[PDB]
PDB file of C-alpha atoms and ligand atoms in Angstrom:
ATOM      1  CA  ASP A   1      16.627 -32.489  -6.443  1.00 31.13           C
ATOM      2  CA  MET A   2      14.265 -30.111  -8.237  1.00 31.13           C
ATOM      3  CA  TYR A   3      15.164 -26.583  -9.364  1.00 27.06           C
ATOM      4  CA  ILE A   4      13.601 -23.509 -10.874  1.00 28.36           C
ATOM      5  CA  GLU A   5      14.358 -21.473 -14.063  1.00 24.22           C
ATOM      6  CA  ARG A   6      12.781 -18.064 -15.027  1.00 22.94           C
ATOM      7  CA  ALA A   7      10.526 -18.394 -18.114  1.00 22.23           C
ATOM      8  CA  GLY A   8       9.397 -14.762 -18.442  1.00 23.79           C
ATOM      9  CA  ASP A   9       7.049 -12.028 -17.140  1.00 26.44           C
ATOM     10  CA  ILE A  10       3.314 -12.613 -16.481  1.00 28.86           C
ATOM     11  CA  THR A  11       1.291 -10.197 -18.711  1.00 30.27           C
ATOM     12  CA  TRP A  12      -1.875 -10.423 -20.826  1.00 30.10           C
ATOM     13  CA  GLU A  13      -0.780 -10.293 -24.577  1.00 33.36           C
ATOM     14  CA  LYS A  14      -3.328  -8.686 -26.958  1.00 34.36           C
ATOM     15  CA  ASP A  15      -3.664 -10.456 -30.417  1.00 35.55           C
ATOM     16  CA  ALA A  16      -2.642 -13.847 -28.927  1.00 33.29           C
ATOM     17  CA  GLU A  17      -3.642 -17.194 -30.501  1.00 33.66           C
ATOM     18  CA  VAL A  18      -7.387 -17.706 -29.668  1.00 34.50           C
ATOM     19  CA  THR A  19      -8.272 -21.410 -29.492  1.00 32.94           C
ATOM     20  CA  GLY A  20     -10.027 -24.030 -27.339  1.00 31.44           C
ATOM     21  CA  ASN A  21     -13.669 -24.822 -26.628  1.00 35.35           C
ATOM     22  CA  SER A  22     -15.774 -24.159 -23.444  1.00 34.63           C
ATOM     23  CA  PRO A  23     -17.365 -27.449 -22.115  1.00 33.43           C
ATOM     24  CA  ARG A  24     -19.801 -27.968 -19.161  1.00 37.42           C
ATOM     25  CA  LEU A  25     -18.692 -31.141 -17.354  1.00 35.87           C
ATOM     26  CA  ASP A  26     -20.259 -32.811 -14.304  1.00 34.18           C
ATOM     27  CA  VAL A  27     -17.340 -33.900 -12.203  1.00 33.24           C
ATOM     28  CA  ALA A  28     -16.298 -35.226  -8.695  1.00 30.30           C
ATOM     29  CA  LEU A  29     -13.172 -34.521  -6.634  1.00 32.72           C
ATOM     30  CA  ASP A  30     -11.773 -37.349  -4.461  1.00 33.65           C
ATOM     31  CA  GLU A  31      -9.637 -37.053  -1.214  1.00 36.26           C
ATOM     32  CA  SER A  32      -6.515 -37.386  -3.383  1.00 32.92           C
ATOM     33  CA  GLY A  33      -7.371 -34.200  -5.427  1.00 30.05           C
ATOM     34  CA  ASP A  34      -8.144 -36.385  -8.502  1.00 30.11           C
ATOM     35  CA  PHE A  35     -11.143 -35.435 -10.682  1.00 32.81           C
ATOM     36  CA  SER A  36     -13.443 -37.920 -12.314  1.00 34.33           C
ATOM     37  CA  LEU A  37     -16.379 -37.549 -14.705  1.00 33.90           C
ATOM     38  CA  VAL A  38     -19.784 -38.203 -13.095  1.00 34.46           C
ATOM     39  CA  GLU A  39     -22.471 -39.892 -15.266  1.00 38.33           C
TER      40      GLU A  39
ATOM     41  CA  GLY B   1      18.735 -16.986  -5.541  1.00 34.73           C
ATOM     42  CA  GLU B   2      16.286 -15.490  -8.041  1.00 33.25           C
ATOM     43  CA  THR B   3      12.992 -14.239  -6.555  1.00 33.14           C
ATOM     44  CA  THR B   4      11.800 -11.799  -9.194  1.00 30.99           C
ATOM     45  CA  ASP B   5       7.997 -11.952 -10.049  1.00 30.24           C
ATOM     46  CA  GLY B   6       7.222 -14.071 -13.069  1.00 28.05           C
ATOM     47  CA  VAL B   7       6.605 -17.594 -14.337  1.00 29.44           C
ATOM     48  CA  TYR B   8       9.317 -20.302 -13.793  1.00 27.46           C
ATOM     49  CA  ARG B   9       9.952 -23.847 -15.050  1.00 28.73           C
ATOM     50  CA  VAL B  10      10.319 -26.673 -12.478  1.00 26.84           C
ATOM     51  CA  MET B  11      12.975 -29.104 -13.628  1.00 25.55           C
ATOM     52  CA  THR B  12      14.626 -32.223 -12.279  1.00 27.83           C
ATOM     53  CA  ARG B  13      18.037 -33.910 -13.057  1.00 27.23           C
ATOM     54  CA  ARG B  14      16.957 -37.262 -11.415  1.00 27.14           C
ATOM     55  CA  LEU B  15      16.271 -38.781 -14.846  1.00 24.60           C
ATOM     56  CA  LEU B  16      18.084 -38.693 -18.328  1.00 24.84           C
ATOM     57  CA  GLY B  17      19.128 -35.075 -18.902  1.00 24.96           C
ATOM     58  CA  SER B  18      17.153 -32.267 -17.462  1.00 26.94           C
ATOM     59  CA  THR B  19      13.357 -32.974 -17.399  1.00 26.87           C
ATOM     60  CA  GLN B  20      10.644 -30.386 -16.922  1.00 22.97           C
ATOM     61  CA  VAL B  21       8.106 -31.682 -14.351  1.00 25.72           C
ATOM     62  CA  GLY B  22       6.015 -28.541 -14.210  1.00 27.15           C
ATOM     63  CA  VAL B  23       5.695 -24.653 -13.913  1.00 31.28           C
ATOM     64  CA  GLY B  24       5.015 -22.137 -11.167  1.00 28.33           C
ATOM     65  CA  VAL B  25       4.354 -18.400 -10.354  1.00 30.50           C
ATOM     66  CA  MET B  26       6.758 -16.271  -8.270  1.00 29.80           C
ATOM     67  CA  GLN B  27       4.676 -13.360  -6.744  1.00 31.35           C
ATOM     68  CA  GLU B  28       5.675 -11.266  -3.705  1.00 31.70           C
ATOM     69  CA  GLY B  29       8.618 -13.618  -2.687  1.00 32.84           C
ATOM     70  CA  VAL B  30       6.299 -16.746  -2.780  1.00 30.87           C
ATOM     71  CA  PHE B  31       6.590 -19.425  -5.359  1.00 33.74           C
ATOM     72  CA  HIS B  32       3.188 -21.057  -6.083  1.00 34.59           C
ATOM     73  CA  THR B  33       2.950 -24.389  -7.984  1.00 34.70           C
ATOM     74  CA  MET B  34       0.668 -27.539  -8.113  1.00 34.06           C
ATOM     75  CA  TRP B  35       1.282 -30.237  -5.443  1.00 33.06           C
ATOM     76  CA  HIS B  36       1.503 -33.038  -7.936  1.00 30.14           C
ATOM     77  CA  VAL B  37       4.506 -31.276  -9.564  1.00 33.51           C
ATOM     78  CA  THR B  38       6.924 -31.128  -6.622  1.00 35.53           C
ATOM     79  CA  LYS B  39       5.159 -33.451  -4.096  1.00 42.03           C
ATOM     80  CA  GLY B  40       6.154 -30.984  -1.340  1.00 43.06           C
ATOM     81  CA  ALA B  41       9.915 -31.429  -1.850  1.00 40.65           C
ATOM     82  CA  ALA B  42      12.155 -28.407  -1.400  1.00 40.84           C
ATOM     83  CA  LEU B  43      13.246 -26.546  -4.559  1.00 43.23           C
ATOM     84  CA  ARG B  44      16.454 -24.973  -5.582  1.00 45.33           C
ATOM     85  CA  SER B  45      17.160 -21.508  -7.326  1.00 42.32           C
ATOM     86  CA  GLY B  46      20.872 -21.383  -8.105  1.00 43.13           C
ATOM     87  CA  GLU B  47      22.765 -21.493  -4.671  1.00 45.54           C
ATOM     88  CA  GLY B  48      19.479 -20.765  -2.878  1.00 44.73           C
ATOM     89  CA  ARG B  49      16.782 -23.015  -1.305  1.00 46.75           C
ATOM     90  CA  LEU B  50      13.002 -22.794  -1.373  1.00 49.83           C
ATOM     91  CA  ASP B  51      11.257 -24.575   1.442  1.00 49.05           C
ATOM     92  CA  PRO B  52       7.543 -25.535   1.418  1.00 48.36           C
ATOM     93  CA  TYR B  53       5.207 -23.339   3.508  1.00 48.37           C
ATOM     94  CA  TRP B  54       1.640 -24.455   2.773  1.00 45.95           C
ATOM     95  CA  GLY B  55       0.210 -27.310   0.807  1.00 45.21           C
ATOM     96  CA  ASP B  56      -2.931 -29.421   0.348  1.00 46.16           C
ATOM     97  CA  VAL B  57      -3.351 -32.616  -1.764  1.00 47.44           C
ATOM     98  CA  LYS B  58      -7.090 -32.156  -2.399  1.00 47.29           C
ATOM     99  CA  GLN B  59      -6.739 -28.515  -3.629  1.00 47.16           C
ATOM    100  CA  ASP B  60      -3.519 -29.737  -5.400  1.00 47.74           C
ATOM    101  CA  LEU B  61      -1.667 -26.504  -4.639  1.00 48.40           C
ATOM    102  CA  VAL B  62       1.560 -25.731  -2.802  1.00 50.29           C
ATOM    103  CA  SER B  63       3.370 -22.452  -1.718  1.00 51.92           C
ATOM    104  CA  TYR B  64       7.154 -21.911  -1.045  1.00 54.35           C
ATOM    105  CA  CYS B  65       8.726 -19.266   1.237  1.00 53.35           C
ATOM    106  CA  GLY B  66       5.367 -17.943   2.350  1.00 52.50           C
ATOM    107  CA  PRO B  67       1.584 -18.182   2.280  1.00 52.35           C
ATOM    108  CA  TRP B  68      -0.494 -18.313  -0.797  1.00 50.52           C
ATOM    109  CA  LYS B  69      -0.603 -14.713  -2.390  1.00 48.44           C
ATOM    110  CA  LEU B  70      -2.740 -15.239  -5.642  1.00 51.70           C
ATOM    111  CA  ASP B  71      -6.304 -14.226  -4.780  1.00 50.36           C
ATOM    112  CA  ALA B  72      -7.764 -13.192  -8.100  1.00 51.02           C
ATOM    113  CA  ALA B  73     -10.655 -15.219  -9.707  1.00 52.64           C
ATOM    114  CA  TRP B  74     -12.531 -15.784 -13.084  1.00 50.70           C
ATOM    115  CA  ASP B  75     -15.573 -13.659 -13.519  1.00 52.98           C
ATOM    116  CA  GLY B  76     -17.528 -16.466 -15.281  1.00 53.51           C
ATOM    117  CA  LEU B  77     -17.880 -14.362 -18.362  1.00 55.42           C
ATOM    118  CA  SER B  78     -14.587 -13.193 -19.987  1.00 56.44           C
ATOM    119  CA  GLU B  79     -11.883 -15.024 -22.047  1.00 48.48           C
ATOM    120  CA  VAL B  80      -8.744 -15.770 -20.056  1.00 47.47           C
ATOM    121  CA  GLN B  81      -5.091 -16.411 -21.132  1.00 49.23           C
ATOM    122  CA  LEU B  82      -3.216 -19.596 -20.377  1.00 47.38           C
ATOM    123  CA  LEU B  83       0.502 -18.489 -20.309  1.00 48.29           C
ATOM    124  CA  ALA B  84       1.675 -21.880 -21.354  1.00 47.60           C
ATOM    125  CA  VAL B  85       5.313 -22.864 -20.546  1.00 48.67           C
ATOM    126  CA  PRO B  86       5.833 -26.099 -22.385  1.00 53.33           C
ATOM    127  CA  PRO B  87       8.810 -28.488 -21.941  1.00 51.88           C
ATOM    128  CA  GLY B  88      11.658 -27.249 -24.314  1.00 51.90           C
ATOM    129  CA  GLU B  89       9.449 -24.566 -25.827  1.00 55.68           C
ATOM    130  CA  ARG B  90       9.115 -20.874 -25.206  1.00 55.78           C
ATOM    131  CA  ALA B  91       6.326 -19.301 -22.992  1.00 55.01           C
ATOM    132  CA  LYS B  92       3.236 -18.643 -25.091  1.00 54.96           C
ATOM    133  CA  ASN B  93      -0.090 -16.909 -24.250  1.00 55.68           C
ATOM    134  CA  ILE B  94      -3.269 -18.584 -25.505  1.00 55.62           C
ATOM    135  CA  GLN B  95      -6.566 -16.755 -25.193  1.00 57.99           C
ATOM    136  CA  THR B  96      -9.546 -19.056 -24.583  1.00 56.55           C
ATOM    137  CA  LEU B  97     -13.079 -18.969 -23.081  1.00 56.84           C
ATOM    138  CA  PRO B  98     -13.370 -21.369 -20.206  1.00 58.14           C
ATOM    139  CA  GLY B  99     -16.118 -23.934 -19.671  1.00 55.36           C
ATOM    140  CA  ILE B 100     -17.435 -25.170 -16.211  1.00 53.96           C
ATOM    141  CA  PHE B 101     -16.685 -27.997 -14.013  1.00 52.13           C
ATOM    142  CA  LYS B 102     -20.030 -28.572 -12.146  1.00 50.84           C
ATOM    143  CA  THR B 103     -19.380 -30.369  -8.739  1.00 51.17           C
ATOM    144  CA  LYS B 104     -21.385 -31.088  -5.542  1.00 49.61           C
ATOM    145  CA  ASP B 105     -19.609 -28.133  -3.854  1.00 50.05           C
ATOM    146  CA  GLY B 106     -19.951 -25.503  -6.536  1.00 51.30           C
ATOM    147  CA  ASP B 107     -18.829 -24.664 -10.092  1.00 52.20           C
ATOM    148  CA  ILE B 108     -15.248 -24.077 -11.120  1.00 50.91           C
ATOM    149  CA  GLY B 109     -13.646 -22.697 -14.375  1.00 50.63           C
ATOM    150  CA  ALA B 110     -12.177 -25.058 -17.003  1.00 49.25           C
ATOM    151  CA  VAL B 111      -9.717 -24.639 -19.865  1.00 48.84           C
ATOM    152  CA  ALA B 112      -9.746 -27.043 -22.731  1.00 49.17           C
ATOM    153  CA  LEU B 113      -6.260 -26.817 -24.206  1.00 50.10           C
ATOM    154  CA  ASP B 114      -3.913 -29.642 -25.111  1.00 55.92           C
ATOM    155  CA  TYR B 115      -0.372 -29.663 -23.641  1.00 55.69           C
ATOM    156  CA  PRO B 116       2.021 -32.245 -22.149  1.00 53.05           C
ATOM    157  CA  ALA B 117       1.637 -33.037 -18.410  1.00 51.85           C
ATOM    158  CA  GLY B 118       4.850 -31.100 -17.836  1.00 54.28           C
ATOM    159  CA  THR B 119       3.016 -27.838 -18.599  1.00 53.06           C
ATOM    160  CA  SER B 120       1.250 -28.237 -15.063  1.00 54.36           C
ATOM    161  CA  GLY B 121       1.443 -25.099 -12.918  1.00 57.74           C
ATOM    162  CA  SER B 122       1.265 -22.499 -15.729  1.00 58.46           C
ATOM    163  CA  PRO B 123      -0.851 -19.621 -14.712  1.00 62.59           C
ATOM    164  CA  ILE B 124      -4.251 -18.663 -16.211  1.00 62.61           C
ATOM    165  CA  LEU B 125      -4.651 -14.839 -16.539  1.00 66.09           C
ATOM    166  CA  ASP B 126      -7.385 -12.219 -16.515  1.00 65.06           C
ATOM    167  CA  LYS B 127      -7.329  -9.086 -18.862  1.00 64.71           C
ATOM    168  CA  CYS B 128      -5.305  -7.217 -16.172  1.00 65.97           C
ATOM    169  CA  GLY B 129      -2.647 -10.028 -16.125  1.00 62.50           C
ATOM    170  CA  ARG B 130      -3.712 -11.238 -12.659  1.00 58.71           C
ATOM    171  CA  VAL B 131      -3.332 -14.904 -11.910  1.00 61.06           C
ATOM    172  CA  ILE B 132      -6.771 -16.285 -11.518  1.00 58.01           C
ATOM    173  CA  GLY B 133      -5.626 -19.964 -11.127  1.00 58.99           C
ATOM    174  CA  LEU B 134      -3.228 -22.722 -12.242  1.00 60.04           C
ATOM    175  CA  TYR B 135      -3.471 -25.137 -15.138  1.00 63.13           C
ATOM    176  CA  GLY B 136      -2.763 -28.842 -14.656  1.00 60.81           C
ATOM    177  CA  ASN B 137      -5.510 -30.678 -12.712  1.00 58.91           C
ATOM    178  CA  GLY B 138      -8.629 -31.875 -14.380  1.00 60.51           C
ATOM    179  CA  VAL B 139     -10.092 -34.723 -16.348  1.00 61.85           C
ATOM    180  CA  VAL B 140      -9.880 -36.963 -19.521  1.00 66.40           C
ATOM    181  CA  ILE B 141     -12.944 -36.675 -21.797  1.00 67.94           C
ATOM    182  CA  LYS B 142     -14.596 -39.168 -24.415  1.00 66.64           C
ATOM    183  CA  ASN B 143     -11.953 -38.391 -27.070  1.00 66.43           C
ATOM    184  CA  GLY B 144      -9.027 -39.004 -24.746  1.00 64.82           C
ATOM    185  CA  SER B 145      -8.248 -35.218 -24.573  1.00 65.00           C
ATOM    186  CA  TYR B 146      -7.523 -33.398 -21.149  1.00 68.70           C
ATOM    187  CA  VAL B 147      -9.706 -30.558 -19.762  1.00 68.33           C
ATOM    188  CA  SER B 148      -7.998 -28.802 -16.828  1.00 68.14           C
ATOM    189  CA  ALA B 149      -9.758 -26.905 -13.997  1.00 69.27           C
ATOM    190  CA  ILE B 150      -8.863 -23.350 -13.163  1.00 71.00           C
ATOM    191  CA  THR B 151      -7.329 -23.944  -9.641  1.00 71.34           C
ATOM    192  CA  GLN B 152      -6.875 -20.975  -7.197  1.00 69.78           C
ATOM    193  CA  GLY B 153      -5.775 -20.973  -3.611  1.00 70.97           C
ATOM    194  CA  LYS B 154      -7.047 -19.086  -0.544  1.00 72.38           C
ATOM    195  CA  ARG B 155      -5.346 -15.840   0.631  1.00 68.78           C
ATOM    196  CA  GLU B 156      -5.561 -15.197   4.373  1.00 70.05           C
TER     197      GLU B 156
HETATM  198  C1  LIG C 201      -2.523 -34.936 -20.991  1.00 67.86           C
HETATM  199  N1  LIG C 201      -2.446 -35.157 -19.586  1.00 67.86           N
HETATM  200  N2  LIG C 201      -2.505 -36.453 -19.118  1.00 67.86           N
HETATM  201  C2  LIG C 201      -2.429 -36.415 -17.800  1.00 67.86           C
HETATM  202  C3  LIG C 201      -2.187 -35.116 -17.399  1.00 67.86           C
HETATM  203  C4  LIG C 201      -2.010 -34.306 -16.125  1.00 67.86           C
HETATM  204  C5  LIG C 201      -1.966 -35.030 -14.850  1.00 67.86           C
HETATM  205  O1  LIG C 201      -1.670 -36.241 -14.797  1.00 67.86           O
HETATM  206  N3  LIG C 201      -2.169 -34.305 -13.732  1.00 67.86           N
HETATM  207  C6  LIG C 201      -2.155 -34.702 -12.369  1.00 67.86           C
HETATM  208  C7  LIG C 201      -1.386 -35.827 -12.017  1.00 67.86           C
HETATM  209  C8  LIG C 201      -1.347 -36.287 -10.674  1.00 67.86           C
HETATM  210  C9  LIG C 201      -2.236 -35.611  -9.783  1.00 67.86           C
HETATM  211  C10 LIG C 201      -3.021 -34.594 -10.157  1.00 67.86           C
HETATM  212  C11 LIG C 201      -3.011 -34.167 -11.502  1.00 67.86           C
HETATM  213  C12 LIG C 201      -3.798 -34.107  -8.963  1.00 67.86           C
HETATM  214  N4  LIG C 201      -3.778 -35.237  -8.089  1.00 67.86           N
HETATM  215  C13 LIG C 201      -2.381 -35.946  -8.291  1.00 67.86           C
HETATM  216  C14 LIG C 201      -1.865 -32.931 -16.195  1.00 67.86           C
HETATM  217  C15 LIG C 201      -1.931 -32.341 -17.506  1.00 67.86           C
HETATM  218  C16 LIG C 201      -1.742 -30.868 -17.568  1.00 67.86           C
HETATM  219  C17 LIG C 201      -1.286 -30.183 -18.896  1.00 67.86           C
HETATM  220  C18 LIG C 201      -2.655 -30.136 -18.350  1.00 67.86           C
HETATM  221  N5  LIG C 201      -2.086 -33.032 -18.639  1.00 67.86           N
HETATM  222  C19 LIG C 201      -2.201 -34.312 -18.568  1.00 67.86           C
END
């Protein structure tokens, strides 16, 4: 049986760690909500 | 139980110790998470119970106690913040600029950050702190890395 625990407020924090790239990917979504790359 | 607005961890005691299977957003008395996290099973918050209200396996979203309340969306221009809640680690905001998932039904946002599968359900925020979607459903790219979509529900 699953249970929930509070992990904090939801706020935007200025001066946060800025990382990660921005890629454009051609994808497909199946009936099961599972993504797949299209080529 | 506790129904204060905020971000929450979704845990399970079904395995060895307490394992984090995901994350979710409590907003306006409704707990929003990803369907693959809870599978539509009821959740517990202390002595209290949270029963499913809405869910969809294709969208991969589920709401508890009421209908989906999160209606904000990415503008397609600005940098967002993944409020990552990783297993055993403290909540941490990571500012990033999303990419794009181009599909046959329109384009969606996409955050390229590397976290364990148990981080699924963590909200993605706009500059106002509004939840523009959940992190945890996407694809594996050429280098084995995971790129998640920005998944938002519909508000009626
Ligand atoms: C690194 N990594 N490897 C796998 C994963 C997944 C994942 O398996 N998501 C998932 C699973 C089942 C289903 C759906 C999605 C939707 N249909 C059902 C999630 C994340 C999140 C942190 C980003 N990281 C992963």
